[PDB]
Amino acid sequence: RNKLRRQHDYDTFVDL
Amino acid sequence: TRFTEEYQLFEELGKGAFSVVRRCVKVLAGQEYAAKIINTKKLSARDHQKLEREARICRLLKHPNIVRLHDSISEEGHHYLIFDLVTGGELFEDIVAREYYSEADASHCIQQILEAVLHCHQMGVVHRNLKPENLLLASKLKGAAVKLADFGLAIEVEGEQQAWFGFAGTPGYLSPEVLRKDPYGKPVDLWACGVILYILLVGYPPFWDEDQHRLYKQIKAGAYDFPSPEWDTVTPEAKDLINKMLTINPSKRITAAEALKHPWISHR
Numbered sequence: 001r002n003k004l005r006r007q008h009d010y011d012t013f014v015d016l
Numbered sequence: 017t018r019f020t021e022e023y024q025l026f027e028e029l030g031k032g033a034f035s036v037v038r039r040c041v042k043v044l045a046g047q048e049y050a051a052k053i054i055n056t057k058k059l060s061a062r063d064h065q066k067l068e069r070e071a072r073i074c075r076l077l078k079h080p081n082i083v084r085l086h087d088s089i090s091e092e093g094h095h096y097l098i099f100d101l102v103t104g105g106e107l108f109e110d111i112v113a114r115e116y117y118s119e120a121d122a123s124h125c126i127q128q129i130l131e132a133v134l135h136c137h138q139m140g141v142v143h144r145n146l147k148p149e150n151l152l153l154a155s156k157l158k159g160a161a162v163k164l165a166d167f168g169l170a171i172e173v174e175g176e177q178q179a180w181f182g183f184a185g186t187p188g189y190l191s192p193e194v195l196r197k198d199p200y201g202k203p204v205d206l207w208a209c210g211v212i213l214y215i216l217l218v219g220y221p222p223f224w225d226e227d228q229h230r231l232y233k234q235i236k237a238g239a240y241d242f243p244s245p246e247w248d249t250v251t252p253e254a255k256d257l258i259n260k261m262l263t264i265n266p267s268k269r270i271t272a273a274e275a276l277k278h279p280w281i282s283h284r
Binding site: 010012 | 062066108111112145147148149150166168169182183184185186187188189215219220221222223224228243
């Protein structure tokens, strides 16, 4: 399906 | 300064890095508020910037579906943001704990989100970070209103003028235009609204992968669908709106106003 988990706010491009 | 003498500090309400928020009382008035206490100089060079921004931009928005900032205050090594008190928690907590919303309540929800967002765009503010975590419920009541929050990443725009405001926001709800260092503006919020509306109705996001690279690829491609079974019973106008919000070219993407007129939200 995909997952609804919590995500954080970034101020810049932080490649993960 | 003013806070210590005017405002009386109560219980611990919530935490979030170097910023504890508490229920406070403007003693003379008697009225009660959420006061965000923030450590100064424990903060970084960039953090103070996002604080001025938050302060300035919130002191711009008078709307029942936007958490009001009543007073920004600075004292010895602590800054104080005084807001409307809200005890309904995040829209995330409520979705998580109710799996999904009915069309009825999803329409009622994103309506308030769309009006908050429209006032925002009318005062030339773009939020860039809409998400269930950044939307708060007035109180623990059924029917309690939805109040937009967190303007640390919000930016002022001039008319309908577009520009590179930097890569900022949250992987899931980021617009394609941002993912392509494109000059962006008002429409990035609608993309984010689309994503929220999808979540609202089924309880999972349209775009998601364990690899950011693949997540941004499918976002960039508009590569979402409406799976069976769950999506099968869902009105084709509801789906329609989400297409018109998760439109991949921000020109031909729906606006905040256009949306509040759409038959899925309006007849309600």
